[PDB]
Design an enzyme around this catalytic site. Structure first.
Site: not given
Ligand SMILES: [Cl-]
Ligand SMILES: [Ca+2]
Ligand SMILES: [Ca+2]
Ligand SMILES: [Ca+2]
Ligand SMILES: [Cl-]
Ligand SMILES: [Cl-]
Lengths: 546, 546
Positions: B205, B211, B265-266, B351, B382, B511
């Site tokens: 934005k 980053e 954002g989310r 969040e 599994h 941050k």
């Molecule tokens: Cl396994």
């Protein structure tokens, strides 16, 4: 093992957590900078720092007592000796033998297993070399461009994890991994591929694993439909010991690679199960991967408790779970190539230690395996670290990062990566007080009422524990050493818990009921006698499918 | 909202859980098969069944009283009305407006936002159509074959999740997603691609996201190094509102797509942030994705409490976390294409609700957001269902499955997939007693001593709760509807917790410290008095980097 002493020591640890463990980590670090040195260890370039955990010298002394009372060392010796420590299935536990290049012998039931282990790796290497070079071609003479592994659980997560982790060491052929019974998986994987240049690897010890073999038959038809029945032998390999069944499938014996009952699925990536990894990175890299695990094994076996990285890692994990009461642990590798490490570690940890009965079949005395979860950093920071910092529960962090990346022109990005890793553990420990939050807002010159209103929302309790693992660079050896560290921490915790890390009876009820429900779901029989929810869901599926 | 009534009802729920909620689920189903009907709801083809949860009519009445006491409905109305319900940031919360094709107007600060929303979608669609058709070419005249999205957090997880989920609707071009600051991510992604046929989408934005913009400059240098500086304008698009910075970077006006402060954002995959999804599946499919979300919005807004799917999902989620004390929840979609749904839901849920203060800045009264985790079925079975069945903690399950797959020739695999989904919830509820375990062993003719040794390891407590969601087929509309269901359950839980679902102050400390730490890690500056662990880790890095 001393049950009375063990119980007494557990009680001492609970009293200690309540009354004596450090509460203010800023203050602890301020008064006692020596704590970094006292609560860290190295193995070669690997640094393990747990000094941001809520521990002091009395904590570590009690944890040593615990390890002694649980007989961690004697239980470990039994494992290395080939004793049948998987007591409920009456099996040895010798994933360590899979990477053992130093021992003269390792005995299981009077048989030295090391030559068999090494022979299989040699045959895997010759095959991998042949596939990689184009010496071994498809049925129409094409170099193999794509390999597709088909397996479930331990026949999949390790191969996926390691192959992604070692991307800088992997060229051609491309590697794909199918595991879900959902037809989307095999369909989406095979659709873009050419059978003429594709090798399918079927990983199943018995060659009767229902999901894997269903996928395998789908792949077999995909090959035969285009290239003919006769072509199957040039487009398949098997990781299996069912020589009768692999022959019936049409796979030649020289493309079948075995393993042993004392290799657990979730400890099998080191065996023939790692064939797709070896094809991806080559045998030399695969052997380096084995060598790194082997270095951690020798360390685990030989280092005294106070210098022993996996013992300390297991003691700290046990502390967090069973004493501090943390129900989960977040494993956050600061390496995009370890994107599938957390999922791998979920199986290793949760399937080993998600148990409610002891070796001797009695109810366990406390919490056992925690939920393990995570995503790579920095990604995870922007998804769920909000909760790790400001949520109501404390969740311990296990951070992993390399000193160097593989991109010579992007070391500045690697510096940002490392800075973020270190900043997150620093943040979890130090937090931010109301006065500090207030001061930051005042420095923006917001109206006093707004400062007062917003400040409490920017408070961070801190004192949230973490440990950090740093290695020089993620290469095959370092990856092997890392996975082995986690294998052994899980062993350690299981011994303290008093459980069998190596069985998995908890998957049987679901399989049983799925077998019964298949013909019901398929419209071949009624859900007579089942609970009304199962009935109602079956009825809905039938109605929506009609 | 009635704080005293709410506290009172919570206390009643705790007492009800201890004394009155069903403890034996086999008995609860057999005596009262009507519980399936009473504890399930539909919206069109979507079935939501919570009858395997540990609830009865008294639980459900108390949960209704809770919703009323929390003023779920008043708070929901305030969201739809464009009130500034994100109070700490003083913003509206209007992701619902992004997909609203039915309302005449939606006002923020007296201004109807709907025409702006629809105009951005129209512009995105024209651009997506051009890229897809080959009308819009690279700087040397090639059809675009690959798109690379660069973003963090909500500018990445949604795009990734939805693009994978809608693989059957995605032909060309290929879609790639970069997010990690780790140089491995951009390097591995760009390495195999040709800049001449590659479009980079920068999602930020502000166009200053550290980053993302580092990655964006790396990608820009990648384009310019091969094609030249002038070519940048034909190989980039922006999802941003920083028009001066986007223009300075080299991105033309007609390839910049905006969004608004009231899109979190989310909650942003519905907006211009969804551009890469729209290029992947086409605008018609993207509009179907929006329509599915919109159908769930209308339902959420208009259905009375006990007929309202998100309300009931949030109430059951709250019950599990705050009353029953379950610190996590496992979301297991039986669909390989939903492989990245759990990671998406982690950000959405954790969040939003990983908060320790109420709207008014006071400490919260009990637990807030849980840890959310999962993998697709059957894969997860599994990996970790061992622990879900036999671990010491109960972890509630949320199962998702389709009645129909996308591969008619593999519908037998789809039957196996559905059978496994239903079997797992059945097994979690039913369990297996010691005598039942013994009888199975006795039926195999095992010696009595072995039967007694093994049986306790094969016991399953049962009474472990689950809910199941079934839809006809995972198509764009169904995906949209499913995500919106989870947005609104998160909303509902937040209102009961009394927190702001829509801020994220908890990401700031990390941050701040990472910004400070970068030059210390790089060695550009000396040390300046951080804790001994941070210092120790920095010193180690410096030592290992030469
Ligand atoms: Cl396994
Ligand atoms: Ca590579
Ligand atoms: Ca029955
Ligand atoms: Ca709990
Ligand atoms: Cl103040
Ligand atoms: Cl600007």
């Amino acid at each position: 093992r001393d049950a009375t002493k063990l119980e007494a020591t557990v009680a001492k640890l609970k009293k200690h957590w309540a009354e004596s463990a450090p509460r203010d980590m800023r203050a602890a670090f301020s008064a006692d900078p020596g704590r970094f040195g006292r609560y860290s260890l190295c193995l070669d370039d690997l640094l393990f720092d747990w000094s941001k955990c809520r521990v002091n010298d009395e904590t570590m002394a009690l944890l040593k007592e615990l390890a002694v009372a649980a007989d961690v060392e004697g239980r470990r010796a039994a494992m290395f000796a080939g004793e049948h420590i998987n007591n409920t299935e009456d099996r040895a536990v010798l994933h360590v033998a899979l990477r053992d290049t130093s021992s003269k012998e390792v005995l299981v039931d009077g048989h030295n297993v090391l030559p068999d282990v090494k022979h299989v790796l040699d045959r895997m290497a010759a095959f991998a070399d042949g596939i990689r070079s184009g010496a071994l071609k498809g049925a129409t003479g094409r170099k193999i461009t794509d390999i597709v592994n088909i397996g479930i659980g331990g026949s999949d997560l390790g191969p996926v994890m390691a192959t992604l982790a070692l991307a800088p060491y992997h060229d051609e052929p491309r590697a794909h991994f199918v595991s879900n019974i959902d037809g989307a998986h095999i369909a989406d994987t095979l659709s873009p591929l050419d059978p003429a240049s594709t090798l399918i690897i079927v990983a199943s010890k018995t060659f009767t694993t229902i999901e894997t073999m269903t996928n395998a038959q789908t792949a077999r038809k995909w090959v035969a439909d285009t290239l003919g029945e006769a072509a199957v032998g040039a487009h398949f390999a098997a990781v299996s010991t069912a020589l009768d069944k692999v022959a019936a499938f049409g796979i030649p014996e020289d493309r079948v690679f075995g393993f042993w009952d004392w290799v657990g699925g979730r400890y099998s990536v080191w065996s023939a199960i790692g064939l797709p990894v070896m094809i991806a990175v080559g045998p030399d890299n695969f052997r380096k991967f084995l060598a790194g695990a082997h270095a951690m094994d020798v360390h685990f076996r030989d280092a005294p408790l106070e210098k022993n990285l996996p013992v300390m890692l297991g003691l700290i994990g046990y502390w967090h779970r069973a004493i501090c009461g943390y129900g989960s642990r977040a494993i956050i590798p600061y390496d995009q190539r370890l994107s599938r490490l957390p999922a791998y570690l979920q199986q290793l940890d949760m399937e080993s230690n998600g148990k409610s009965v002891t070796l001797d079949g009695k109810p366990v005395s406390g919490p056992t395996g925690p939920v393990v979860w995570g995503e790579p950093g920095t990604n995870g920071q922007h998804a769920f670290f909000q909760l790790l910092h400001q949520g109501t529960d404390t969740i311990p962090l296990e951070f992993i990062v390399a000193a160097k990346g593989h991109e010579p022109t992007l070391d500045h990005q690697h510096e940002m990566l490392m800075a973020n890793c270190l900043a997150q553990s620093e943040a979890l420990m130090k937090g931010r007080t109301l006065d500090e939050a207030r001061a930051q807002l005042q420095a923006k010159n917001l109206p006093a009422s707004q400062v007062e209103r917003i400040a409490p929302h920017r408070v961070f309790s801190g004192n949230r524990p973490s440990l950090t693992l740093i290695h020089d660079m993620l290469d095959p050896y370092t990856l092997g050493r890392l996975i082995a560290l986690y294998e052994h921490r899980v062993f350690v915790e299981a011994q303290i818990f008093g459980i069998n890390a190596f069985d998995q009876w908890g998957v049987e009820l679901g399989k049983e009921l799925a077998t019964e429900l298949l013909p019901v779901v398929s419209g071949k029989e009624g859900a007579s006698g089942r609970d009304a929810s199962t009935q109602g869901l079956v009825a809905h599926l039938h109605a929506r499918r009609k």
